[PDB]
Design a protein around this ligand. Structure first.
Ligand SMILES: Nc1ncnc2c1ncn2[C@@H]1O[C@H](COP(=O)(O)OP(=O)(O)OP(=O)(O)O)[C@@H](O)[C@H]1O
Ligand SMILES: Nc1ncnc2c1ncn2[C@@H]1O[C@H](COP(=O)(O)OP(=O)(O)OP(=O)(O)O)[C@@H](O)[C@H]1O
Ligand SMILES: [Mg+2]
Ligand SMILES: [Mg+2]
Lengths: 198, 97, 246, 49, 233, 212, 84, 148, 49, 49
């Protein structure tokens, strides 16, 4: 047999879509009203359903849901690029207090570009493009390109939402905290985030 | 440092021994036992701070001796006083040994 | 001033209790006895008299305290005995009115372990008559006879000023209990019954309840109508027009 | 307020049931001339809201 | 319209915060193992705080969306809420329902339970991060919170001279140490709330009434012998 | 009555989804693996609950299909909830050759065990060697380095087909492998003796195959 | 399990035996007496926990007290003995 | 035949324990103390030392027993302090051989509250050596230090 | 499973449900004979399918 | 079922005149062959054969 509430949950019309998304690694935040409510309602059974795949369904303390694969995962795994994590950590830093007054929650690609460039070390930058590269225009261009690329990747993850127009301006969701540092009693988020960035 | 130690007191076990020896006669003669009278007589032999423990232990020993047939009558028992300062007990008389 | 109190709990013809009445304390009542003596049975009686709903009632063992529904047995059937059984509460309001509330329980015959339950209430009883006396006949035999609801109704109606009310639905029973100040909230609907039972059973087993923790705002905050009804009335003209168009 | 005291209070306050509490009643004196849009009989009371 | 709605919402929020703050004080200095206090932490969600401020002060920037008679008020609220925080998605549900959700004040509040453990500050209460007794004590605390809230809620529908009864249970009470039981007795006594506790004789609380149980076989049937004591202290 | 599985789901479908074989199979299927007769467990499972699975997957806008040869696979629709991809032309060359190898009674005596060298030899025997070499390198003119590169690309693509379930290597020797009936999908353009253009049109209409 | 492994094991080795029980206070004196005699007849070791000393006349016992001390925590352990 | 026995359990740098050694009994060992004293923690350390499989280890409260919860946190991390930690068992073999099994535990820096485990075994240790002293270095005036 | 059930005490739901798997041991002699039959029955399955 | 499979046609046809055992029943278990109602998964349980 099968638990009644589990059968009810997976009978719901929203399940196929959410399943598809989840398996991809997408994070469900409070923004997605219906999906988030659905997970809140049926967590106790969905956790068991996905445990059958050797994959863990976690609700982050901030509120967003996501899947974590075990070593024995039944779902084919994939891994992010160094540049990816770099960018991610950047976005976590930009989820700041003056952000509210600085941009009202809406950023641009150039903000991230310039922040990246300014805060990172040259060496790691080079490592990101090619070790033989040296402070050249073309290099910068390629870096830009990669930035865009990775940003798109992230958008697939649900970390960042593009505003619906062709231009590259976006808003940062709470789920970006997954990149963030460990927090200890009384520690300032800016300092610890920068400490890891360094 | 090295482990220290602490020891238990056997005063309550001794108390149980005196009470059980004092109560054994009722069974041997099959004499009807009333908790009210027995508690009132037995609490007089100890000071007030120890009354509660004496009452508990005495009840523990007494209930093992037979049953009270009145319990099947549908008639509740009254709350009998057993000392000053206002302590009370509720129990039917023990008849069936 | 002068909050009400529960005065006593009575069991009739339960497993191990033919006829027993407990006089409840004003602050603390402590049940004590070896394993299997019947303590949890008395608390089962209390809560079943309080909330007579067979959909919610589930007396799982204390070990495995938090698991799923699991078995189809709710654990209540085995606590009864063949024949007719009762569970009743005696209450004193702030008005000092003596009200007796309870239920009648019976094992439904069959392969499965099912139970039949019927609530009732009595008002105006003299202070001189105890529940056990009402519910039993002192026939010549060694042991009395428990008398069904028909005999009970006939016996009570004979009394002067005593009223016997017998309910057909749980909702009415809870409504009367609330009106007399026996419970803190009137259980409008099944959802309210479920939350009240959650409260009781969470207290019974102990620990930080998962369900209470999930829906904290639903439990601790009252719902306010003022913010809404203005806009329902203002919205009315448009609603009717839209429905007419469709 | 409860249903038992509701009739008492409604009788007590009479027409002034639906007045406004305002702790000074002199601060309204300048505003008052402007009141051209109001119920034909407005009630004002002084006290701690 | 506009400001007045914001004011009624703000006053309702303020009153709820104050009542919670009053309930909160009764639970100060409750000792349960290393736990020394319990609180109900109440906060306002940002996405709604900005909406409330906008509705209070920037109404001239959005009046087109409010006085357009082709849509109703609740729909206007939903559309304004989507105009702010544009990243929010809507699950193919009618804007009417989202509007009525915005009309319900409770949706603006965020609620947590916190405990003042040991040398540390205020921590969110997680079951896995507490001993057994601490968990039981915290549960009792939250339960009395609920009961007090419900009594305050219903009193506007009850007679002026009626005070409902209050009673709670505790099974396998042996799990609590003497200090914790003293704390629990103090709480219930201060709250005029009755208790029924079961323990296999390991605990002997001096105050209150005690019942001794013994199960026997009599005429080939199970029978429970009962004795009672009270009045000590 | 209420709280009853039938309210939300057919009993047989729930029974299937509760089976211990389902997660494995699901995972695989989604990844594009074909299921033949040799992997009994899986195949049998598929057979037992065919219609329930079909109905299930339909939710996704994907067809669970059964070829006449007895092998199952997934075909996504245009509105598919699950991404769809296409094989490379080299994969097709190796696919059609593996198909002819399966049919060949001349090599049936091997009991299905073939060697990469035999496959390569058959391929060069039939296709235009020097013109096919163009896909390896634009300057290829029959040099041994380029011939070894071709052989390595073949080894690689073959390894990909193995993952699709179209061929199984031996337990201890990787230079040898065995075929399965799933390879017959490479013959979908000629199984009926009709106009090739019309066949191709029909296939693209059904979502079986795309042009390049 | 022990029986099963009889063949693979060397002749001369009998494996260790040990079990746990938290919140032992849920058991009454008669039940604990039963449990002790069962485990001793089977050469089975036990580790049990309870807020109050439920086993005064058998085996060893330790008493734990936690002290807050200079903005951290420290546990003090002392033994208990049946008679004094 | 003489069956083997567990001699003792040792904890180093756990939550509330710096370096403590419990000597087990041949039949029964009891732990007593008020709520929050640290009894369940001692149980957890033993079990940990027994089965280091991090996949398995899940220390629920005694309440909520039997509920398969998938909780976000397994409850082990908080029972450890910063720095290095140990948990070891001393066993007397049926062969009258003294063997010391154990694990090295250490918190992982990072937002996720993860833990690292490294098992180890010691054979032939002289009977006069106590694990508490073997695992620590005497630095300063009776102010010992733990060593990796 | 064993250890954890002992620690929390009581009738462990998982233990009783699969009691065969826990108590009854496996036999290699059974297997050696069954090998042959195994091959045969596999073949029959093939055919059936 | 073990008796059904063990005892074969030629000798035990004189034994087979009992109402409980026949040859066709081995194929009748083909119905049971397809899927038994196993619940928890470890190692590899599959079918009646
Ligand atoms: N549903 C049931 N069916 C059969 N027997 C039952 C049932 N419920 C309880 N019993 C038996 O009734 C007796 C009393 O059980 P109960 O749970 O009331 O004990 P208790 O005094 O609360 O014990 P403890 O405090 O140790 O849990 C025990 O013999 C128990 O086995
Ligand atoms: N994961 C954790 N994170 C933080 N503190 C913890 C954690 N686990 C336990 N503690 C704390 O450590 C102390 C010891 O808890 P523990 O459960 O070991 O005590 P105990 O004496 O067994 O108590 P009880 O008998 O009530 O279960 C308590 O203060 C508990 O709050
Ligand atoms: Mg019990
Ligand atoms: Mg503990």
């Amino acid at each position: 047999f099968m638990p009644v509430k589990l059968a009810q949950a997976l009978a719901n019309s929203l399940f196929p879509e959410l399943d598809s998304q989840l398996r991809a690694g997408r994070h469900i935040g409070i923004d997605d009203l219906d999906n988030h409510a659905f997970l809140m309602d049926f967590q106790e059974q969905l956790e068991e359903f996905y445990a059958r795949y050797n994959v863990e369904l976690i609700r982050a303390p901030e509120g967003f849901f996501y899947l974590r694969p075990r070593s024995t995962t039944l779902i084919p795994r994939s891994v992010l690029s160094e540049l990816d994590m770099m960018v991610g950590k950047i976005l976590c830093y930009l989820y700041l207090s003056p952000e509210r007054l600085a941009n009202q929650g809406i950023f641009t690609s150039q903000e991230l570009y310039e922040e990246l460039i300014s805060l990172a070390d040259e060496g790691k930058l080079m490592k990101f493009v090619n070790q033989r590269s040296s402070g050249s225009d073309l290099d910068k261009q390629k870096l830009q390109e990669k930035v865009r690329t990775t940003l798109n990747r992230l958008r697939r993850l649900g970390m960042v939402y593009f505003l619906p127009n062709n231009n590259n301006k976006f808003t940062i969701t709470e789920a970006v905290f997954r990149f963030g540092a460990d927090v200890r009693s009384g520690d300032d988020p800016r300092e610890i985030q920068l400490r890891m960035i360094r | 440092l090295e482990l220290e130690y602490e020891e238990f007191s056997e005063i309550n076990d001794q108390l149980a021994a005196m009470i059980e020896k004092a109560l054994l006669v009722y069974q041997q003669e099959q004499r009807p036992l009333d908790l009210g009278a027995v508690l009132r007589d037995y609490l007089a032999q100890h000071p007030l701070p120890r009354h509660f423990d004496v009452a508990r232990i005495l009840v523990d020993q007494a209930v093992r001796l037979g049953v009270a047939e009145a319990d099947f009558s549908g008639l509740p028992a009254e709350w009998l006083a057993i000392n000053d300062y206002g302590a009370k007990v509720q129990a039917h008389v023990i008849d069936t040994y | 001033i002068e909050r009400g109190k529960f005065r006593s709990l009575t069991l009739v013809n339960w497993n191990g209790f033919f006829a027993r009445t407990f006089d409840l304390d004003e602050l603390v009542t402590t049940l004590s006895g070896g394993n299997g003596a019947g303590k949890s049975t008395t608390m089962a009686a209390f809560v079943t008299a309080l909330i007579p709903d067979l959909t919610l009632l589930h007396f799982r063992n204390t070990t495995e305290a938090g698991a799923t529904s699991g078995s189809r047995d709710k654990g209540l059937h085995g606590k009864l005995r063949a024949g007719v059984c009762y569970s009743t509460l005696d209450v004193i309001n702030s008005r000092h009115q003596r009200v007796v509330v309870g239920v009648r329980l019976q094992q439904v015959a069959g392969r499965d372990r099912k139970v039949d339950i019927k609530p009732f209430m009595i008002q105006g009883l003299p202070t001189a008559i105890q529940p056990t006396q009402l519910l039993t006949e002192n026939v010549g035999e060694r042991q009395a006879r428990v008398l069904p609801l028909n005999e009970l109704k006939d016996r009570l109606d004979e009394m002067e000023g005593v009223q016997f009310k017998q309910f057909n639905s749980i909702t009415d029973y809870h409504a009367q209990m609330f009106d007399l100040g026996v419970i803190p909230k009137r259980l409008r609907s099944a959802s309210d019954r479920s939350k009240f039972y959650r409260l009781i059973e969470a207290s019974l087993y102990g620990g930080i309840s998962s369900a209470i923790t999930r829906s904290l705002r639903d439990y601790l905050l009252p719902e306010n109508s003022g913010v809404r009804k203005a806009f329902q009335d203002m919205e009315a003209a448009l609603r009717e027009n839209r429905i007419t168009l469709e | 307020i409860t249903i038992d005291d509701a009739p008492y209070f409604s009788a007590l306050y009479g027409p002034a049931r639906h007045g406004i509490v305002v702790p000074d009643l002199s601060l309204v004196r300048p505003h008052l001339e402007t009141l051209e849009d109001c119920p034909e009989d407005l009630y004002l009371i002084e006290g701690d809201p | 319209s506009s400001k007045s709605v914001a004011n009624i919402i703000r006053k309702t929020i303020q009153r709820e915060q104050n009542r919670i703050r009053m309930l909160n004080q009764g639970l100060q200095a409750v000792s349960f193992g290393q736990v020394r206090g319990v609180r109900l932490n109440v906060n306002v969600r940002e996405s709604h705080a900005i909406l409330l401020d906008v509705l209070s002060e920037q109404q001239e920037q959005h009046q087109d969306l409010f006085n357009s008679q082709r849509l109703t008020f609740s729909e206007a609220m939903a559309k304004l809420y989507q105009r702010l925080n544009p990243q929010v998605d809507m699950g193919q549900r009618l804007p009417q329902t989202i509007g009525e959700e915005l009309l319900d004040y409770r949706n603006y509040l965020e609620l947590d339970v916190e405990v003042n453990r040991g040398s540390d500050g205020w921590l969110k209460a997680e079951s896995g991060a507490l001993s057994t007794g601490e968990a039981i004590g915290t549960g009792m605390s939250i339960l009395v919170m609920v009961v007090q809230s419900w009594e305050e809620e219903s009193r506007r529908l009850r007679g002026k001279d009626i005070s409902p009864c209050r009673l709670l249970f505790l099974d396998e009470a042996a799990r609590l140490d003497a200090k914790s039981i003293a704390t629990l007795f103090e709480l219930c006594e201060r709250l005029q709330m009755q208790l029924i506790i079961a323990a296999p004789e390991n605990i002997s609380p001096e105050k209150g009434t005690t019942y001794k149980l013994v199960r026997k076989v009599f005429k080939n049937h199970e029978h429970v012998h009962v004795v009672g004591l009270r009045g000590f202290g």
